[PDB]
């Protein structure tokens, strides 16, 4: 997710009747022509087209090649100038919305702590920190939500929440 | 054992998405720029990242360069202040950070003296010197902290400080 949206690009103003394979061939050819590939082979793994709203997403094999492809904004395909942008959920600062959850009762397991977090929406990452010697929870965890706009809702809802004997600390892990 | 883990360091708070090669290149460059390298060639042989828990272990070519690199604690790498620590099973040789505590009131018992010391962190060794025949205190003690980093904090917090009519002396016992 955090690097997932870091490997896709929005493409607007696509030619009528274009196929996903044709778009893929075009962008791979352009990457090779521009000397923008960081390895042999094909930087674009997949494309998904919405015919009716005339846009597509490209999926790249690497974060650096995705960034390189931003240079193609305005490129001509079948006589039309393509609009190239980041996905709206692109994170320019990776990990900016990772949360630290502290003050967890030390008997709670992964699933139980997740059940607390997922009241606000699905998670893309979670881990509960445990003492590797004993397997015992150290009483803190980290997570990231699928929808990064839920992060501040979750902090507002959970930070300072009394959880039996303990008071939660929920903040950006930073 | 006593001589284990002498050429590795824990690095926490690493940049989200960072590669092992990028971390390696960064530390090797810093060793060079910072004047901590002690011979031609790369001091860092390898970096092993745990992506789920956001830490790395650096593997060094030498014992002395590992020690040197501890000075990088807190260095900012791609926006993140790195946490640099010894491996948990690394231990200095016994008595390396033994402390002498002088100027104690002689009516205070072992546990009462220990209380002042344990406020800084747990002890792995302690003894209050007493007259064997009578069992009464000679007003000085020795100790060693579990965490060797605590040693300088105890010295800073207690050395030269007023305790009753006496000024405390807290110093490394050799």
Longest dimension (CA), chain B: 65
Instruction: Out of B16, B52, B53, name the one closest to residue A94 (CB).
Output: B16
How far, in Å, CA of A170 to CA of A85, rounded?
A: 33
Closest by CA to B17, choosing from A145, A4, A73, is: A4
Contact check, Cβ <8 Å, B52/A127: yes
Enumerate residues 6+ apart whose C-beta is below 8 A from A138.
Answer: A106, A129, A130, A131
Q: Give yes or no for a contact between B70 and B83, defined as CB atoms under 8 angstroms apart.
A: no
Q: How far is CA A159 from CA A167, B2, B98, in A?
A: 8, 43, 42
Enumerate residues 6+ apart whose C-beta is below 8 A from A4.
Answer: none
E strands present in chain B: 8-12, 44-50, 55-60, 76-77, 80-81, 83-85, 99-102, 123-130, 137-145, 162-163, 166-167, 169-172
Domains detected in chain A: 1-92+149-174 (3.30.70.330), 93-148 (3.30.70.330)
Q: Give yes or no for a contact between B37 and B22, defined as CB atoms under 8 angstroms apart.
A: no
| Binding-face residues of B in 29-58 toward A, CB within 8 A | 52-54
Rg from Cα positions in chain A: 21
Q: On the CB side of B123, how many CA atoms lie within 13 Å of its CA?
A: 19
How far, in Å, CA of A64 to CA of B93, rounded?
A: 47
Contact check, Cβ <8 Å, B79/A63: no
Model resolution, angstroms: 1.9
How far, in Å, CA of A71 to CA of A64, rounded?
A: 12
How far, in Å, CA of B62 to CA of B45, rounded?
A: 10
Q: How many CB atoms lie within 10 A of CB B1?
A: 6
E strands present in chain A: 8-12, 44-50, 55-60, 76-77, 80-81, 83-85, 99-102, 123-131, 136-145, 162-163, 166-167, 169-172
Q: How many CB atoms lie within 10 A of CB A46?
A: 13
Q: Give yes or no for a contact between A103 and A166, defined as CB atoms under 8 angstroms apart.
A: yes
- Residues of chain A contacting residue B16, judged by C-beta atoms under 8 Å apart: 2, 94-95, 98
3-state secondary structure of B64: helix
Among chain A residues, CA nearest to B78: A93
How far, in Å, CA of B38 to CA of B67, rounded?
A: 12
Q: How many CB atoms lie within 10 A of CB B141?
A: 23
Give the H/E segment covering residue A154: helix A151-158
Q: How far is CA A109 from CA A125, A133, A170, B163, in A?
A: 15, 16, 17, 47
Confirm or reject contact between A131 and chain B (CB < 8 A). no
Q: Give yes or no for a contact between B99 and B8, defined as CB atoms under 8 angstroms apart.
A: no
Q: On the CB side of B129, how many CA atoms lie within 13 Å of its CA?
A: 11
How far, in Å, CA of A108 to CA of A129, rounded?
A: 11
Q: Residue A174 is encoded by which pair of tokens?
A: 């930073």
Confirm or reject contact between A3 and chain B (CB < 8 A). yes
Alpha carbon A155 to its chain's center? 20
Closest by CA to A107, choosing from A161, A145, A162, A164, is: A164
How far, in Å, CA of B142 to CA of B119, rounded?
A: 16
Method: X-ray
Q: Nearest CA to CA, how far is A143 from chain B (Å)?
A: 10
Please say whether the dihedral angle defined by the alpha carbons of residues A33, A36, A39 and A45, taken in this order, is positive or negative. Answer: negative
Among B12, B13, B14, B16, the residue to mutate for chain A (most A Cβ within 10 A): B16
Q: Residue B18 is encoded by which pair of tokens?
A: 């960072």
């Amino acid at each position: 997710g955090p690097l997932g949206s870091a490997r896709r690009l929005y493409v607007g103003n696509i030619p009528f009747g274009i196929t996903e394979e044709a778009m893929m061939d075009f962008f791979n050819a352009q990457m090779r022509l521009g000397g923008l590939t960081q390895a042999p082979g094909n930087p674009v793994l997949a494309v998904q087209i919405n015919q009716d709203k005339n846009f597509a997403f490209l999926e790249f094999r690497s974060v650096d090649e995705t960034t390189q492809a931003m240079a193609f904004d305005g490129i001509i395909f079948q006589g039309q100038s393509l609009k190239i942008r980041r996905p709206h959920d692109y994170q320019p600062l990776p990990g900016a919305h990772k949360l630290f959850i502290g003050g967890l009762p030390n008997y709670l397991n992964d699933d139980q702590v997740k059940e607390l977090l997922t009241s606000f929406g699905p998670l893309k990452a979670f881990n509960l920190v445990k003492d590797s010697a004993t397997g015992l929870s150290k009483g803190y965890a980290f997570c990231e939500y699928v929808d990064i706009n839920v992060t501040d809702q979750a902090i507002a809802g959970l930070n300072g929440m009394q959880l039996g004997d303990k008071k939660l600390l929920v903040q950006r892990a930073s």
